[PDB]
Amino acid sequence: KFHTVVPSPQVKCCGSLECKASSKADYTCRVFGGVYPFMWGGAQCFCDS
Amino acid sequence: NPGAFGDIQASSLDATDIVARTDIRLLKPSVKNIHVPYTQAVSGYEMWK
Amino acid sequence: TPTVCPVPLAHTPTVTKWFKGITLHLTATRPTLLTTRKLGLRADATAEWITG
Amino acid sequence: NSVVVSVLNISATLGSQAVLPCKSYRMVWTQDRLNDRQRVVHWDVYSTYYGDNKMERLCDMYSAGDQRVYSSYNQGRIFMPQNAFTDGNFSLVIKDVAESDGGIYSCNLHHHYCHLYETVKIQLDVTKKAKAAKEYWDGEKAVIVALEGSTVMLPCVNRNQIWTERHSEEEQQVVHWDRQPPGVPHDRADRLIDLYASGERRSYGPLFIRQKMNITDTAFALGDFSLRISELESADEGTYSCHLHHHYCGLHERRIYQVFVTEPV
Amino acid sequence: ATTHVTATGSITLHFSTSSPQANFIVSLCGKKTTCNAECKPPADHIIGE
């Protein structure tokens, strides 16, 4: 029995970024724009979507 | 082969190098807070068990 | 009162290949309702409950 | 924390009656037993290309409702992500754009209960050559230029806490009339009277002054929280403060009146 | 449905058919012309488009 890895996501604020693969087995990666970041501390960073 | 015996394979128990594929697909952020929704098939070990 | 409510999104199945047919490897963890029907004159309504 | 709406000096005359007009018809509370619990957004295009040159509503989203297209064609053409209702990105998507489709777009938000509405304006244009197809920002509006039949996007996002879903229990809109005792600086008042959205009123101090401190019985409904003080006494001398807070709408305001008792002249 | 025309140009076209005997008549501008060929079944045989 295995366990999935859920590492801390990368957030680039009001800019751009690109996906990169990893040597880890059964690895998966994907970007997403127009994020809606919120947390108990609030909007992690600021720019109009 | 996802959903089958021996989905996760390794040369040794404590081998750093591993190979596996279990059909992991990322989901787009869909809520207020920062979250990473992950969808994956059930582990094959418990299935064969 | 009516109000918005959440519902789960199940693990989407895997579409396979079959001449004049289709084989689906359905994966789920809790009971779910599946159904389908032919788009022709014959309704061919089909419904089922899948546990695992 | 409330924000001082305005500060006014009141030359209240001893014996006479003074009025503090703290009130707002925006603060009015719904009278019907079913206070509105829904909000609406919509998109409307004013394309002067039409000889009729009217404004036509493409579509509208209702809170906790179902997407409904006014016409029979915008379905498929118009895409309003349902999940975006939580995100607040009330953007619009056109699949194909025609020469008769370009014009003026407007994204509008309306809320009956809070009585707050907003509008944002955008411009759309279509050209046969993609060379001139480039967006630009005019400060007061945005102009979109794209090839005929090309998919285009128009953004309408407010990023506001009120317009995003929050199923908070409807706290009664607190209203506080608090008077600073004589010779006391501001922010040190003791609540003379408290008013709840439910209509219940909590009285403080003597009952006779409260009776003479006339307040319309429908103040919680009409929002006319203006304080009418009669038979002014030296005890009533001091600054008055009218605080209002609405948790559901999130409003927070305060009105300060420098009420000093002046002998008749 | 339409395309540019040059003095001696040649242009391609995309189309579909419901028969493997791709014999028919097509008109460029006003003029007509016969054109024939044979088509093969595809590898993929399930699509909803």
Per residue, the 3-state secondary structure of chain D, as one string, reads CCEEEEEEEECCECCCCEEECCCCHHHCCCCCCCCCCCEEEEEEEECCCCCCCCCEEEEEEECCCCCEECCCCHHHHECCCCCHHHHCECCEEECCCCCCCCEEEEEEEEECCCCEEEEEEEEEEEECCHHHCCCEECCCCEEEEEECCCCEEECCECCCCCCCCCCCCCCCCEEEEEECCCCCCCCCCEEEEEECCCCCEEECCCHHHHHHEECCCCHHHHCCCCEEECCCCHHHCCCEEEEEEECCCCEEEEEEEEECCECCC
Is there a contact between C7 and C20 (Cβ–Cβ < 8 Å)? no
Whose tokens are 């957030």? That residue is A11
> Is D82 an interface residue toward B (CB < 8 Å)?
no
Q: How many other C-beta atoms can be found within 10 angstroms of the C-beta atom of residue E6?
A: 7
Inter-chain contact C11–B40, Cβ cutoff 8 Å? yes
Q: Which residues contact C50 (CB under 8 A, 6 or more apart)?
A: C26, C28, C31, C32, C34
CA–CA dist D218, B49 (Å, integer): 71
D89: chain A residues, CB-CB within 8 Å: 34, 36, 49
Tell me the CA distances in angstroms from B11 to C32, D53, D125, one per residue in order.
38, 74, 62
Residue at token pair 């219940």: D200
In angstroms, this model's resolution equals 4.7
Closest CA to D61 of D30, D91, D104, D95: D91
Round to whole Å and give the CA distance between E38 and C44. 36
Pairwise CA distance, residues B38 & A4, whole Å: 9
CA distance D158 to chain C (A): 21
Q: Is D142 an interface residue toward A (CB < 8 Å)?
A: no
The experimental technique behind this entry is: cryo-EM
Of A1, A27, A8, A28, nearest in space to B17 by CA:
A27
**D248-252 contacts, C-beta under 8 A, 24 or more apart:** D248/D113, D248/D114, D248/D168, D248/D170, D248/D171, D248/D173, D249/D113, D249/D114, D249/D116, D249/D162, D250/D161, D250/D162, D251/D27, D252/D1, D252/D2, D252/D3
Distance, in Å, from the CA atom of D40 to the CA atom of D108, rounded to the nearest integer, reads 9
Interchain CB contact of B30 with D (< 8 Å)? yes
Give the Cα separation of D103 and A31 in Å (integer): 34
Backbone φ, ψ for residue D243 (5° rounding)? -105, 135
**Dist. CA D158–CA A49, nearest whole Å:** 10
Query: Which one of C4, C9, C27 would you mutate to disrupt binding with B, by most B Cβ within 10 Å of its Cβ?
Result: C27
CB < 8 Å to C3, chain D: 64, 167
Of the candidates D41, D88, D89, which has an alpha carbon nearest to the alpha carbon of residue D68? D41
Contact call for residues D185 and D256 (beta carbons, < 8 A): no
Instruction: Round to whole Å and give the CA distance between B29 and B44.
Output: 28
Residue C36: enclosing H or E segment and its boundaries? strand C32-36
Q: Is A6 on the interface with B (CB under 8 A)?
A: yes
Tell how strand D251-259 and strand D3-10 pair up.
parallel
Q: Is C49 on the interface with E (CB under 8 A)?
A: no
Task: Please judge whether A34 and D155 are an interchain contact, meaning their C-beta atoms are less than 8 angstroms apart.
Answer: no
**How many other β-carbons are positioned within 10 Å of the β-carbon of residue D193?**
20
